[PDB]
Structure formats: structure tokens, C-alpha cells
Amino acid sequence: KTWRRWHRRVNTTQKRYAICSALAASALPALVMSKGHRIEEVPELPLVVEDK
Amino acid sequence: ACARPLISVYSEKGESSGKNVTLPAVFKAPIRPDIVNFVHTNLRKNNRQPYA
Amino acid sequence: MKFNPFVTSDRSKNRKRHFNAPSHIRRKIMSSPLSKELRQKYNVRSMPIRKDDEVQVVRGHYKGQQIGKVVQVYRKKYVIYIERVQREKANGTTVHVGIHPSKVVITRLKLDKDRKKILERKAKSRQVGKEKGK
Amino acid sequence: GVDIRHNKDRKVRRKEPKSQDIYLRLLVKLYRFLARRTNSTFNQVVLKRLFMSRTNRPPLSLSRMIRKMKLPGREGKTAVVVGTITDDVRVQEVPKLKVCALRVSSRARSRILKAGGKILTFDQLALDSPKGCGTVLLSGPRKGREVYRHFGKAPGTPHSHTKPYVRSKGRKFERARGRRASRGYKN
């Protein structure tokens, strides 16, 4: 049927918690290599570049 | 409050200049992959077209 | 990617618009690139092929350096027949083996006024595009 | 053939927390090691109450924490709760505290840190007192949930004070035959 419960809404605080955990594990290169990103020449893993 | 290091800002050719920004506490937020997987697999169902 | 929501980008719909295209769209689909001398002389990347254009065969079992005139352009099967691109049957008669125009390079065009104005329009569009990119 | 009644051979207690949360699993590992190494029973009770579920570790309130810590003898004492510390807005004054918990809410945390107390975690509690000396282990209201008001003796039965499952309370949904002496019978 078309009226299946297709969509799921999550709590806003849970969505903010999960996105803060994702931003926190965007650091920690042991979690980045275990994801599978080749990292071997990256000078600093919180890679912040200019505003240019 | 936890420890916050000082991340450098790289230029357009590598070659890190004298600009240094303190790391936010968002990167020191706790990691819970069960919450990340919960929120991911519940928000992933929202861009899903119906079939009948 | 494509951003226009009116462009199709669908598998079966693009196969439908390809294999059920009318003749004036089949003429544009059956276009072939030009040789490097013709590209340097006209600044034209590709052109649709005509009844009596001169053709080198680029890929296939009939690959070679022989410049062969097109016998005829058969737009139903999306194919062209060239002079020396033929094959003997069992009964000894020679039948021209068709080559798809994507594996076909043009060495000499058969120039008329319509082809001259098409190449001038395409060269003007390339000039406007190069000026916009410059 | 031996006559063991095998109905109760498998003890149904918790061996591990059913949750997959990794901070709680690290706290579980640390208190596993403290339970099977230290001779104290405090670490065993802390491990057993880290095993339990969310409806089984009840939230403990700040005014009940003040009440149970202003008992005589427990000066210089810490309060170890294996659930959550919730704030009560109906208490006015709060003394110095030393509260160990899994999670303290923001209002209770601000109230304790404004009163001048200390809020430790369980790893800091293990670094402070590994055997559990100077501790009082507390727990919130276990029967305090609304779910226990429907349990026990059945309604429609004399000397029973069980809340029945009513979709909407009012005048004409109940309090008729079965509750009135005029309509047949009451209980």
C-alpha cells in the first residue's frame, strides 16, 4: 500500500548528538583509516585551509 | 572541559602559515556509534519514494 | 551531473528515444568526427555524414588506412555503406558491410552551400565559446 | 535417568548489558575487573546495577538525594547512584555534595556546581576509592513508575486498589455496575 509508514522522524537532540559524534570522529585518524581513506601524506587530519 | 589543542591553517600549496585556531569541543564530543547508526538508518528512510 | 529536470537521464527512456528517433534526429545521432587537417582548417569537431563523403575506417575487423567513399547512409539500422568495405557472400556476390559512423573519420567533405553555412555556424559558435572561456 | 527438574537450571539473571553503547561497555569492563579482583561487594553491586535496564535503574531526584545524605554519620561521604540524578525545582537550599552518577541533568549539574559540590563519574570514582570506601550507594523509586499502578491484584475485585486500563477517564467510561452498589454490585 501507499500508506505504509515509510518515513521515520528522530528526536532533534538525537540528531544533533549523532552529528556531533560524526564531527568528533571526523578527527581521530585511526577512525578515518578504518573507514578506508588513504591518509598517508595528509599533513594534519583536521585539515583547515585558507578562506581563498 | 577537556583539552583543546591548536590546529594550524594550511595555505593553498600546503606550507602551513602562522595562523592557528584552537580546536573546538565538537571534536571532543563523545562517540556513540549505536546512536549514529540509529539516526542514520532512521533518517535514511526519509528520501525513499513509495511503491505499491 | 545534469541539473535540468527536463533532461531525461533514464535508461529505458533514453533507449526509447534512441531506437525510435525520427529521421532528422537520426541524422544528428549518426555524426562522425573529422580528421586533424579538417579540424585545423575549419575548427569543427564533428559533422553528420553525407551520401558521398570520404571515409577512413578506424576500428573493427575492416580497420585500415584506405580512404573509401560512402556508398550510402542507411539511417534505419544506424549504419553507412562504404565502397571498398564489402564482403563476398556464398554465391560470389559482394555485399557492402555496414560500419557504424562512430567508428568513422572524415578525410574529405562534399561541400555544398548548406554544408558551408553549417560549418560557418559551428565555427562561429566555437569562436563565441572560446571568447566566453577566454 | 536422573530426576532434575530442569525448569530452573538456567538462572535468568543478566550477564552483560543488552545495550551496545561503548562508554557503558568500558565502565562495565572496569567494574568487571574490580568485581573479580577486589574483595569488596560495592564493585559487585555497581556492576550488577550497570547491567540493568533503563526502566530498572530509576531516576533519582535531587531532594531525595539531599534527604538521604543529610542523615547523621555520613559527613565527608559521597553518594553513588547507578542511574540518573534529576533536579527537583521544589527544593530551595542545597548543601555541598559529592555525587557519582552515569548522567546528571543540566539543571541539577548547574545547581550542584553553584552550591559548590563535586560531580564525579564512575572512572573518577574508581580512581578515588577503588574499594568503595566513603560511599553510600543510593537508588531511585523503583515502584515509582505509572506502570506499577496497574499491577498486582486485579480490579473488579474487593480490597483491590488497581488502576484499570482506561483509554479516557470520565463519568461514563467506568464507575457503574462493578463500582456502584446501586448498579448491581461494588467491590
Added chain:
Amino acid sequence: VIYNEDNGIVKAFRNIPGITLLNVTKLNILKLAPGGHVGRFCIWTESAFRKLDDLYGTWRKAASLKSNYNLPMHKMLNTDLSRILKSPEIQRALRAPRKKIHRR
């Protein structure tokens, strides 16, 4: 790649395969943790790495762009339980083990 303003970075990192662009205030969970796996290689800018503090703040400061949101608290702070168990404050109180394997 996380960008702050649109001045051509979205047009630039557009046909290079693999790069997903995210705005600072419009961060997406489905692109910061694809497939449920939490780690992701991210390239920040200066005005993104400075605006994260204006998005979520520290523990002793509010979000300052959101209405009511503080950072969450850790269930345990020091997660280096190897260092915790090899610290002398616990091993002074620990007893002697029983590791002699007594077989049948």
C-alpha cells in the same frame, strides 16, 4: 569538503568524483557518516573551523546560534582504562591473582 559561503567552491569541487560539499549551518548526517560508519575524511576551511564554535559551543557556553542546545556530557571522562588499571591507586588496593591452572 565543508564550505562556509558559495563563491565558486561548489562549482569547483563538482566533477571531481568522491567529494561531497557541505555548508557549515547545513551539515548532513547522511554525508558526514555514510552507511552508518562514523568516520569520514573531511576538509575544512578557516571560516568553517571557526564557525563550529559558533554552532555548538563548548561545554561551558551555549550554542549561540541555536536557541536551547548545550553540548552533551561524557558518561566517563578518562577512557584510557589501561592507564587507569596500571595506575598505582588501584593496584595498591588490588589483591594477588590466582592464575595457576589446576587441571583435572
Added chain:
Amino acid sequence: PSRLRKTRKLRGHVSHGHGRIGKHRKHPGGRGNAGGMHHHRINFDKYHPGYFGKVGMRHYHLKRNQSFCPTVNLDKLWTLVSEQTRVNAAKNKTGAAPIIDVVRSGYYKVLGKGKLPKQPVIVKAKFFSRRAEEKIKGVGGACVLVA
């Protein structure tokens, strides 16, 4: 997740968890709440008392706008007002006695549950409880009506 439901562990089992002797028929005891006084009477007596019968008067055009009377206790009374108001209390050599407007906070009647701290107040509410008024006048406050 149909991967984790019970119908996967019942593949190969004949009666599918619903009994061999008494089969899973369509409606063995009627549809819905069938049989109130008959054959479900023991269930409707020992689990739903008061379900059958009329009681009380009938108010035909009822509306919650007339009977809307939200209640607040004296135990949560300083919660409606900011904390610096009770920081700046028992001072200034005056008997400062701040005003707690209850209708401004969103309640009408002030009830008398709980302990009230020793500080004079001016509670402005539409209705009062007698026990609440006794606690307020015992602390040293004043109950002011408002419409």
C-alpha cells in the same frame, strides 16, 4: 525488520505457532468487543468494572473553556519567577515581598500542597485554596484576587 520477526523462525513448523488441535480459525469468539453480558462476562467483570450502565447527569453542549482551571501548588511557586528575585530577598531592611502573578505564568488556582519557604509573597491568582491561603498567611504573605 521482517528479518527479526517471528514468522522467520516458524518456517517448517506446520501450525505456525497457533496450535495443532484448535486451529487458528478466523473469529472464534466474535469480532471486537463481542459478548458483553455473555461468554466474556468474567473478563468484563474482573478486568473492566463499571463498563456497563448509566451514571450521572448529561451536559449536552459541554466545552472545556468554562471548566479550564489549571492548578499550581505552593511547593512549586518560586519556580515561576526568576531566581534573582529570591536572591534579592530577606534584605533591603524593608520586607521586600515580591509579587508572583500566577495568571501571567499560566495557572488559575493555587493549591496548598507542599512546604513553602519563609519569605513574604503577594500571590495574585483567580482562585485560592483555603490550605494555600493558610500557608501563605502563616509565612507572612498576602493572597490577592484577580479577574
Added chain:
Amino acid sequence: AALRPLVKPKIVKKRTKKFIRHQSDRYVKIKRNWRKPRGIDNRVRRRFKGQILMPNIGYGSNKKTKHMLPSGFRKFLVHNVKELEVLLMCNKSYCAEIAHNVSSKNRKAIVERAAQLAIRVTNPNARL
């Protein structure tokens, strides 16, 4: 000479025949894969005398010799050359197994790399 394992135990097996399904001899649609009888009156289910036997937990092989080849190794399915350095510290107890979908061009490279790394392959002479 061949590649010898670390230890060579005597692999004992409680049963080496297959647990065939009931009436698979009679019917062609009934495969040899085991299905437990769940009938009210079934000879195999209530275990009469001299029939097919049901697979119980009692036929379990020893944990030291479980999943063990008759040569003394344990199989590990290997697709490419990079997966051969996985078994570099396990060559005395584990052996490589080249997959079916691996072409004959790099199969020779996998065989010569395992010969350099002293890892036994149970099928080196297959394609050539």
C-alpha cells in the same frame, strides 16, 4: 617435498556419511539436504529402529580438529595477491584457497607469491 603443518593430530570423525533427507530415495523433488521431520507420526522423528538418524549436537567434531583438512591445514579463501600477506604469520596452520572467479593471468602470480612466502595452496595446478 610439500608444505607440512605445525602439528599433525589424528583427525577423528564421529560420522563421515551424509545426513540425507527422508524419502529422498523415493522422490526426486526431495533433495538430499536435511530437513527435520515435524509430523505427528513419523518414524524418523520419534526415532524407530534401523532408519536414518537425525543430526544432533553429539556428532560434533573436536574443537582442535574442527574445519581441518586431511593434510592438517585450515582453508582461507584468497582472491588477490594482497590477501596472501594475510596468511604470512599463519602458514604453519592455515592454507590459501584461490577463488573460482580469479583469472588464470594473476593466478600464476598468486601461486608464485605464495611459493615465495612459503604458504601452501591447495590448488596450484588448476588452470595454466
Added chain:
Amino acid sequence: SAHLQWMVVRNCSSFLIKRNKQTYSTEPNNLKARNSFRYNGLIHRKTVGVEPAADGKGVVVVMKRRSGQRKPATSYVRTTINKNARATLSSIRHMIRKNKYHPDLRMAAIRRASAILRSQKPVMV
């Protein structure tokens, strides 16, 4: 720290490999290739890795520096040992012994180093 990211990595890492009852781990600086808490070089503060040389003769030894986290380009230092193989085993043994540099990886790194030594020679006739 380390146990936290081990609790993350232990089941959903890209280098994890199941398939036929053994769970290995295929990242660099994982000698003995186990999916264990002892043998994992990405997580820990101190990391010993043993690899064959790119030229084909010698063994490179990888040491984690400790001088900077969050910086994978300068996180490791590589050295090359191409000697008469007894000095190779003794040099790697002294690296892991005298520097107090995580002595649990010591004998296993000796195993992997001397297995690479037997790898870099003509094996058959």
C-alpha cells in the same frame, strides 16, 4: 583514547576480514595480522610495524613517533635494515627492548622480520 576507538573499530573497520571462520585485519603496521587489541597499529600511542623493502633487499621498520597526533604524515618514521640478518634480528630486538617501546610486539616483530628474510631469497631449485 585507545579503548574507545577499539570499541568503534573492532567490528566495522574497512581492514577487517571474515570469510571462512578466521577474522584477520589488513591495515599497515599490523604485524601477525590479528584483529586483536594487542596487534593493532592504527590505534595505539606506540606502534611497531615490519614491512619488506621497496627495492626487494632489506626490511623496513616503522616506529610511531608520539610527537604529534592528528598528523598522519609525520606520525611514523621508517628505517631500513639490510645486514647479515643476525644483526637485523638483534637490531629490531634492541629497538623494541632498550627503548621501552611496547615490548609486547617484540618477539612477534622478530618473527615477521625473519619471515620476510626467508621471503627475500630464492626459494626453490
Added chain:
RNA sequence: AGAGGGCGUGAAACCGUUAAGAGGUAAACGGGUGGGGUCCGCGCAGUCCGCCCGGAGGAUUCAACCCGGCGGCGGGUCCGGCCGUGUCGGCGGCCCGGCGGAUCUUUCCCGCGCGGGGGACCGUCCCCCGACCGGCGACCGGCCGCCGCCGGGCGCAUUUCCA
């Protein structure tokens, strides 16, 4: 065409032929074996080697030990500086910082008793040097101990490879 105009691959039920085995308790099955076949793994002996040591054949270099350079680990009176948290000092930023308040002031201003901007007050976030406790894995520059790498002096009782 081992793709031949209902033609991509072409299973099972069923049929034909060839090869093998068998045949009077209908056929078929389980347990235990034996015999005959089709293939697999050896083998003109497979005794397989992995270490340490002794002996007779060979041999290029280097380790032992010093010199110069580079990189790494550990650390002291914490050596000097950044960095970093808990308290104290200047209440200093408070106006040379924004916010919020159900604390006052219309001693003020503007738009007409109201709203905003001022003025104090409170709460939340920061500046400078100095002390103590944990210098805390958040970083360096010198100093010491140790380890590894490169180039020489190291000519042969040392050193390592083939049999």
C-alpha cells in the same frame, strides 16, 4: 550453428544408445563391512625438515671498538619559553565584551501610560604577572642515558653465505 529463421544458457520429470555392475521373497532405505570401477595425491626411496654446536672444503665484507652527521625513546634540580587546568592577587575586560533577567531608575534620550536605545545590579564568557598541587601524552630549544641508520679507520683465531 556444440548459435541454422519459435535459433541467448538449455535443468528436472520422460525416452534412446554406449559402458559397468546385478537380478526368484515388488522396488527402495539405515548401521557395519567386503569386492569391482571413474578420478585425486604421491612415489624409479618421501624419509620432511626448522634452530644451536663440532669437523674438513670455500668467501666477500663487516660486525667488536672509535670519528662525523641524521632520526627516535626515556627523564632529572622541572633547565628556559609557549600551552594547559584547580585555587588565590588586580574586580582588573565590566565603557578600551556580547547576551539574558518577573532586580531598580521614566535623576536620561527618541518614536508617541507604552516600545526601543542608554545608566546602575545580578548571572554567563575573558585580560597581566607570581606561588602550590597533580607538567597533566597540548608543544618546543638546550643537557644526560640509551637505540637505530649512513660514510671512514677496523685484513682476518673475529664476521656472515653455498654444500
Added chain:
RNA sequence: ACCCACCCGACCCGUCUUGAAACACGGACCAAGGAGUCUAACACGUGCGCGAGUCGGGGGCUCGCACGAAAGCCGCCGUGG
């Protein structure tokens, strides 16, 4: 693991039943399809976030929608449950 030979055992599966190998029923054989799903109301148990609060429904503001009819935000952050 293919076939044959011997000794002992061994009645044809599913179902209704107190009882089936049944002179009880369905059943020549084979291939494909084929039967506990979805919405709502609840009840209990469990996982997560916040906590005397919680939730944003609905709506509105940002991107022109490839990824999107996703995501982010709200003196509507509480009208309301």
C-alpha cells in the same frame, strides 16, 4: 563419493484423532508461483535522547531540488498532546 554382495533392522509421507502402515482422507512424476503481511489503537519488555518536563505536529525561513521531494533552523521552542 558410483555399482554390486552379505548380516541385522526396517510397513508410505502430511493431517483429524485417545489411537494410522491402515480396508480413514490428499497424493502419477517434474519445473516455476504459493499462504502470518501493512495501517491504527493499546498493553508489557528492551535500546537511545532529554528530564518535571518532553515532542515539534502543522506551518514558516534557507537552494536554484543531481544526490532532495533529503537536511538545517524557528521572540511560531510550545498553539497543542
Added chain:
RNA sequence: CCCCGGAGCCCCGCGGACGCUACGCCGCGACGAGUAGGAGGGCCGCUGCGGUGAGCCUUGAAGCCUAGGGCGCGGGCCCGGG
């Protein structure tokens, strides 16, 4: 009346696995029937999706046949030939 960069020991309070996917490894003791039914584990199987394997592939994918080698108690799975 001395330190174990080493007393040299069936025990090393000096750092301390070969043994540690701590959701792991190891050591004892008891038990093992089962319909209707209930619960748990599946590195049993099918299909599609988000990640992941610098995955496989015309130097041969899926499917199919097999008198071959096997593994798992089993569901089934991995190779060898066409």
C-alpha cells in the same frame, strides 16, 4: 649483612604473554527424550539499498552438469573438470 640490565629461580612485590577478535581465551562440576508451544544463536540461504574490499571478470561473470577433492552435527558452503 650490596644492586636481581640480572638471586637465576617452581616464582621474580623491577617491566611483565606464545594464551587478550576481554562480545576473547581458559579451568572444574553436573546434565543432555519430546508433540502442541515458547525463547536464543546462525561465519545457513534469496532479493534490493547506504558504506566498505587500490574486491573478481572476455588471459572468461551469472547460470547448469559432474563416477573428483573436501569442510561444517546441520542448514549449506569452498575448490577441480566440461
